[PDB]
Design an enzyme around this catalytic site. Structure first.
Site: not given
Ligand SMILES: Cc1cc2nc3c(=O)[nH]c(=O)nc-3n(C[C@H](O)[C@H](O)[C@H](O)COP(=O)(O)OP(=O)(O)OC[C@H]3O[C@@H](n4cnc5c(N)ncnc54)[C@H](O)[C@@H]3O)c2cc1C
Ligand SMILES: Cc1cc2nc3c(=O)[nH]c(=O)nc-3n(C[C@H](O)[C@H](O)[C@H](O)COP(=O)(O)OP(=O)(O)OC[C@H]3O[C@@H](n4cnc5c(N)ncnc54)[C@H](O)[C@@H]3O)c2cc1C
Ligand SMILES: COC1=C(OC)C(=O)C(CC=C(C)C)=C(C)C1=O
Ligand SMILES: COC1=C(OC)C(=O)C(CC=C(C)C)=C(C)C1=O
Lengths: 404, 407
Positions: B161, B339
């Site tokens: 983000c 966004c």
């Molecule tokens: C402050 C903030 C605001 C945001 N606002 C927006 C918004 O308005 N709109 C939008 O679309 N997106 C937004 N986002 C983005 C969104 O949070 C992420 O892009 C989204 O969660 C991506 O998902 P993900 O599965 O890739 O990772 P995540 O959801 O972040 O989770 C990945 C997971 O992997 C796990 N993990 C890590 N390392 C390991 C390991 N070695 N072994 C096993 N598990 C592990 C973690 O524990 C976590 O649970 C925002 C993010 C932040 C930080």
């Protein structure tokens, strides 16, 4: 075990610093951890792959360049614990230090390209960046008959950013003087949008490319090699999703590069994995007894042996004042140089600093192809390397530059 | 060795979404999620948590509550991957093999790369909306603000983000006006980047707000050191390597440096830079045909957002089905992302684009403009749809609704 000064890496920066450190704290208080049996003057590999120099002339046993009295710990660094001033090696041994100097260089990553390094077992493909593929460049040139000759540039940091096109100008001249030019379509596929980052040398290279019927295709990155089929796959970095399969009669590969694996997760690294040092003094930003030099650092200038030479001079001063409880005052300027080999008789000696602006040493003009600068690159610099830099006496040609 | 037909690494936004979708394809018993955290967070609302508008505890649920029923939950951390031998290692000292592997390990926070952090967070006047441990300290610092510099950073790494480091700036500025202390605040945005935003339509709208609201943006400035005790911050100039600037603050919001998860950085499945190396159209791995990737941990050259995860999850679903039938994928990801730029406590600029970095808006009106509608959708509709639709495998982006608006 414990050493006043512990040096990681027995390449260009590592030997140079251990040479200099021996004179400061005594040879019996310095150790070097380096796993390889050979030490290579890598810059001449460009000319090896062009058939101009022999490969065995580029290397000497690592025991030859160890400053006498300095301990050679032939091992691999596998962990750094700067909180408790030690490192671990693949001998299951823990080594403590009063001060630490990191010179582990840059890591080549041929396997991140689909089909390498296996395809290198087939003809028509080579790469000047590795002792196991530099002569394969030269065989591909001799064996060339008719078609495409492809030269690549990856989407990562590299050492000697000029080398991937140096062998293209060498290969061109080879085909001409050997009667095969008419049968060659010569292609520079590069991940970058520019031929070179400093404009006055870029312009000069642009001139050569325009006169010698060479093609540069920007924002093209090699991702796959089908050696058996003599085909290469490129992705268009301007159009995510788009690719292109090209046949080749000769392929030269500059591999993707990255900081060494043990540094990627280390505490001494920045977010991206390079050693996190002050851009002027080369002292670690978070551990005052750690220092970095050469390709493995995050120093924002081109990764070359010239820069290592100029960096060693500064670091010698920084560690010295630190050992004396004084504040550093001598600052690194980003000096670096690329001797752009444009042919078997000519070199364009580019020199610049952090400002990406030229800073030439000799009073004549190094933007123009010169025999003198070729002879300097091909003959003098290996000699100064083995007999002056690795003995800790060369530290940048700024002291020679201000003479004239 | 323990085995599962579909193994999901990571139980965050992409991992839970792909497991729900996969359960309906291969049966819940043949799906496993490896996730070490007890708690699952809807991170987007943290922007409004740091601004004092929403409660932190509502942003999270127990991980057990979102695990699709019947799917195995392996509470552990992935410590190594070995695609050549179809298996992975865990911090249990246990290996697990697979027929297909979905990688969803998000992105990693590296506060410790800034000298002074995270120890400095023990002090007042400093917060970060990117960590559950620090998002409330932003709000508190904003409540404690009296006079001086309010500084907002943006690191020299990829982020998730990209809009959030400045959403909080606008929210704070409004709050200052809302509480009559706008006069006493000097509001600074120090970015490593050369531009306020990467799509011109929305950059111009943000620039208009920077001008009308008298905000200072200093480009190519990278936070390198915090001295919480003395309330100073040290910035490096990326255009002039070596020089730095020390500046005091009355409030500091840190966007931390970020990077691939350590376990991926050295792994065979990463590219040279550490991101999961996948085909940018089908999300299939470039070198291992039975590995796929989704979300922040991938090399997909577009914004790292949950909206992107949603749009990619619809593609990846189609990709894996076609792969299981040994056919060639034909549906192509276009790079859709979005966004919602919160520009104040009641307005949002809903930015939407794709791989061309050009606008791809869903609603027939112009989302370049601050809108109350788009704020309510960001703040109330989107968490509800997340908990109830995306995590159940029933949201894959809004392009059907965009095509629906065709008369
Ligand atoms: C402050 C903030 C605001 C945001 N606002 C927006 C918004 O308005 N709109 C939008 O679309 N997106 C937004 N986002 C983005 C969104 O949070 C992420 O892009 C989204 O969660 C991506 O998902 P993900 O599965 O890739 O990772 P995540 O959801 O972040 O989770 C990945 C997971 O992997 C796990 N993990 C890590 N390392 C390991 C390991 N070695 N072994 C096993 N598990 C592990 C973690 O524990 C976590 O649970 C925002 C993010 C932040 C930080
Ligand atoms: C084809 C080519 C042409 C070049 N041409 C030029 C040129 O014309 N001009 C120029 O100025 N520069 C040139 N260079 C660049 C120059 O070779 C390097 O920049 C220089 O060697 C930098 O030295 P370094 O000490 O940083 O790393 P290196 O000299 O590569 O040595 C690093 C050392 O670290 C060791 N190491 C690695 N991992 C570990 C570990 N885990 N534990 C312990 N030790 C480890 C390695 O074995 C190696 O000995 C060229 C390079 C190439 C490949
Ligand atoms: C550094 O922060 C600022 C800018 O950078 C984005 C501006 O463009 C502008 C607008 C420039 C003009 C000439 C109005 C102002 C006023 C400003 O403070
Ligand atoms: C609401 O249910 C949904 C569909 O049914 C109409 C879709 O076709 C699709 C996918 C196709 C497009 C064009 C988004 C998604 C993602 C979806 O969520």
């Amino acid at each position: 075990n414990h050493y006043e000064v512990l040096v990681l890496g027995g390449g260009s920066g590592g030997i140079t610093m251990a040479a200099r450190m021996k004179r400061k704290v005594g040879a019996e208080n310095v150790a070097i951890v380096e796993p390889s049996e050979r030490h290579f003057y890598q810059p001449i590999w460009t000319l090896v792959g062009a058939g101009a120099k022999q490969l065995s002339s580029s290397g000497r046993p690592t025991a030859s360049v160890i400053p006498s009295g300095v301990e050679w710990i032939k091992a691999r660094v596998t962990e750094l614990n700067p909180d408790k001033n030690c490192i671990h090696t693949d001998d299951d041994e823990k080594i403590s230090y009063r001060y630490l100097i990191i010179a582990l260089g840059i890591q080549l990553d041929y396997e991140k390209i689909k089909g390498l390094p296996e395809g290198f077992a087939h003809p028509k493909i080579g790469s000047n960046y590795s002792v196991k593929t530099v002569e394969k460049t030269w065989k591909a040139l001799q064996d060339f008959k008719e078609g495409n000759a492809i030269f690549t540039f990856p989407n990562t940091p590299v050492k000697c950013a000029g080398a991937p096109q140096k062998i293209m100008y060498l290969s061109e001249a080879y085909f001409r003087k050997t009667g095969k030019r008419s049968k060659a379509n010569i292609i520079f596929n590069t991940s970058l949008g520019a031929i070179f980052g400093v404009k006055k040398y870029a312009d000069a290279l642009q001139e050569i490319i325009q006169e010698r019927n060479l093609t540069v295709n920007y924002k093209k990155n090699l991702i796959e090699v089908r050696a058996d089929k003599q085909e290469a796959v490129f992705e268009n970095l301007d159009k995510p999703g788009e690719t292109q399969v090209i046949s080749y009669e000769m392929l030269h590969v500059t591999p993707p590069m990255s900081p060494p694996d043990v540094l990627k997760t280390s505490p001494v690294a920045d977010a991206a994995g390079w050693v996190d040092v002050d851009k002027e003094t080369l002292q670690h930003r978070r551990y005052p007894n750690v220092f970095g030099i050469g390709d493995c650092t995050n120093l924002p200038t081109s990764k070359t042996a010239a820069a290592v030479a100029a960096q060693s001079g500064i670091l010698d001063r920084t560690i010295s004042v630190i050992m004396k409880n004084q504040t550093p005052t001598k600052k690194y300027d980003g000096y670096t140089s690329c001797p752009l080999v444009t042919g078997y008789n000519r070199v364009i000696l580019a020199e610049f600093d952090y400002k990406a602006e030229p800073l030439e040493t000799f009073p004549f003009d190094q933007s123009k192809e010169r025999l003198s600068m070729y002879l300097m690159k091909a003959d003098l610099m290996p000699f100064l390397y083995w007999n002056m830099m690795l003995r800790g006496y060369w530290g940048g040609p700024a002291f020679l530059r201000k003479l004239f």
